[model samples]
Target: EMEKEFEQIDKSGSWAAIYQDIRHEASDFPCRVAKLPKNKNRNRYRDVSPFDHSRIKLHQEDNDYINASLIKMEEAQRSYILTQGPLPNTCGHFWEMVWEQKSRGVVMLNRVMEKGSLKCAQYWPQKEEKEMIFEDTNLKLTLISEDIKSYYTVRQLELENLTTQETREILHFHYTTWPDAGVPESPASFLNFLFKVRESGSLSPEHGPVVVHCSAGIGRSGTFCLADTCLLLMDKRKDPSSVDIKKVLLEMRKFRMGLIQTADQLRFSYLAVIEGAKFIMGDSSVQDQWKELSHE
Candidate 1:
């Protein structure tokens, strides 16, 4: 039924086309981001604007705006700060925002380098380096631990205030395999990554909101949020169909611009959502089934 719904939505050609219209409609909204003065550190010419409604404002600071959005899912009790991968120039502001928001983790969905272009700044210390000090923000990031996996890497980061010497731990979950060719080859591997983040309890409400980003902080990042939100709704609400993935995505776009960028991304999101539902429904065999079907 869900696959049929996907086909129905695809042929109706309404949602995908509507997303494109949303792109045009956004221009009608005012972007005072230009007035904020550049050098806030941006990754690209196309991704600098942050929508007014959901943009995170710095505490009484005029020049602290970064290309990021705060998305709170009330139904799922999830709060995610979705922003771009840090630009080489914006690295300091990135750490500042993390400290200001008291964010406990960062979910990074893009690599630092892709296709010979600098996609993300090296915001964290390397494995050999013990700590990194961001002069712009007056914060120090110490590497407490590092765990390398096949498709992802999890690093334990200690963020400290240089003046006060106060510190907080932040988990950095780097998903390395996405967007090379495209989304993950299968949802199984992606689920493994999701579960790893889950086990850390970073996404729970007990901590501050998790920070999520990709190159643009939309496409793949949106897919991750959509899948996790849908699955949680399925578990908490106890009905797979109770939460509409498409509707949730449209609602999420209200918080962040241009989420789930392309039709292919939307399609993969549906696949992940469906697989996630199975996991919550106690179908352990379903993961292997999805791998088999998704593999070829």
Candidate 2:
């Protein structure tokens, strides 16, 4: 049985034992025996607990983006944006933010799931046979995308429903790769991508705010949101001003739950911003872009 194997591995001089010891020590919790929940019912598999929502609405608009305010999650305010590579199944609310640059100019489209609630048989079977449920009107958001292929885009979808046979909105962001790609090394490529999205003018006040997310929705997602927020804030201030990093993080957490998962990831975000700023400010004297790139 799996338990027997685990028990044998828990003995001294084993990787499992070491991992268990470290986790217990770091968490400061006493080791205790407990029954593992059965996977008979999809709802029974509780990997992460649900969040709380009392202070804010189901969805709120902030800085031209629709921020999904979730409590208990890592970040407070979670938003989705275009990723560097192809989308992954692990990424919830997957959607492709499309942009086209042609003689007709730039066009923006948002491709997302039609329904809002559907069960994953592979992950959660007890939630009834696979079906779509769009009753959760409060949390649902309409996605509009006509052109499937273009500059990839991202946006935050809904994530509040958990009913059986429910029609959940599933988004497939059209891309060439899977598992998603990390940001490229060339600053020019990154800037060009952002410039194209901005020029597309697909996002505005009328069609709701844009959303951005990635696997774990912390490292890449957090940094992207932070950069956009900083730019807007800079514009408002009309000068190069510094922001309280901790305050920004805390605010983001308030909306999405957990925005920063580890000290290393948080530190990397700070470094990424500094490098980006240097690139934009044209500080060619500092030739550490490669060093910064490796750190991320």
Candidate 3:
């Protein structure tokens, strides 16, 4: 039924209206925390603010605000700490979050530079540098290893709490080819990348929520979470077709204001969910097809 609905909507060419409708129905929760004068500099974009209800508050004594949200899909047993790309001033706060939350992985969906613009601060350490220190948060990240793939790179970094001398490894999954404010090359490629993240146990309930970010923390981040959440939900159900992607997306919006940014991204989410459902339905061969098509 879900696939049939998606097909009918695509065939009827009403995706625009559907996306607009979702936007119209999305909750417009107050963002009072993000608007505070002191916290204003922490936000990447003026308009893309986190809803105060679900916003992640830092533990710093005088400053506790950051442009991040804790989006939990309880039924899927999944939680994502979705935030905007780290700003030059907020990079310390970013690491503070990872340290406090004990997040095992950080999934970056946008490149540092895109369209000749700086979409995100080069937050992680470079290969040559090998280490980064965040005095503001009393944390340090030392690059452990990097496995470069065609479309994405998986880097293993050692995160140390400068205050306590505690350390943990964090997986940084960087998707390099995704365009700013655009979809990935195809659902196959995106699914392939998604499964790669899954292969690591970082996304499991046993660990802290995975930290996911894009430029504004709404567009590409939302799409990635939407697709991943839908596929996981489908996998748990005997009737994979019973998954209502639209409904799940709307529920996600309750935690973070604008989940999927545009009609095209929304449409792409549908395609990705449908494509990934095949694999969840026991078509193991689909993984090979995804691997073949998504390379470089």
Candidate 4:
């Protein structure tokens, strides 16, 4: 029945080649798609995105925020900066460097600020002109502390607001999660959010970059950064290639200390990147299914 549906879309010629370009490895690791309630149990580690939470204790270490590091992987032509503490109170804490590849790289050291703090919303247009000057130039920036669950869903709402705005400002949001966090129960919703960004063309390299944050600035943020950066690099190369796992970790650690803060986080990064690549390229059976469907 599925094969018949494929035939309806156009069954012959370069369709197979296009299909191959999109197909990649399938993920065997468990992943679910669901929405977490905003007030769900906060201490429980199993209900989060990119699930794996064994390193939450390490995030609270004071020393973890002090020793920052940076590494540049010459071979990959990529640089990673790792830092500790909450993000700076101002934009000054973030650093940006231009690379030979014509790409600009940046790292911001931030902590999870309390939600709904006066500082959280940068612009209060309703206030006086003098006060408006203090408004964050980056309108799309939102600080999502880790205290509440439902972070991913909240992030989706923020993104939706950005999309509806007329000026098309560059949007960035920050959040933290415990290490060894589990996959969100609703992947389709996550995918839907990702697809929205893709459709908006806002997720591409040209639209500035998105910044991710977590406590200690590594565990959750590190994995998200690695996954996002690797995808960008893959898209640029436009070819399938092997990624060096250790080198990536080492590079990220150099930028900010404690990247891949826990062994489990490091492992999860490797696995997540691979799985994400496979999903973007399409599942392993994509090519075969296309053929069968065309014939039908």
Q: Model 4: per-residue lDDT, tens digit, 78-153? A: 3433333322332212211111112222222222343433212231122222212212222233222212223231
Best by TM-score: 3
Tens-digit lDDT track of model 1 for 1-296: 56678777778876567556545554333447633546333534465456777777655364757778888888888888899888777888888888888888899998888888888888899854767888877889888888887678899888998979999989999988775756665577777677668779998888878899988898888988988888888889678877777778877777887778876777788888877778788887876664454331
Provide the lowest-lDDT 10-residue window in model 4.
95-104
lDDT values of the candidates? 0.78, 0.32, 0.90, 0.34
When sorted by TM-score, best at the front, the candidate numbers are: 3, 1, 4, 2
The C-alpha stretches of model 4 lying farther than 4 A from their native spots are: 1-150, 153-168, 174-203, 207-209, 233-241, 283-296
Residue 107, model 3: Cα distance from true site in angstroms: 0.4
Candidates 2 and 3, the one with greater TM-score:
3
For residue 91, model 2's alpha carbon misses the true position, in angstroms, by 12
> In what order do the candidates fall by lDDT, top score first?
3, 1, 4, 2
For all predicted structures, in order, the TM-scores are 0.87, 0.40, 0.97, 0.42
Is 3 or 4 the stronger prediction by lDDT? Answer: 3
Higher-lDDT candidate among 1 and 4? 1
Model 3 lowest lDDT segment of ten: 177-186
Q: Give the Cα-based TM-score of candidate 1 against the true structure.
A: 0.87
For model 2, what is the error of residue 56's alpha carbon versus the real structure, in angstroms, after optimal superposition? 9.2
Higher-lDDT candidate among 1 and 2? Answer: 1
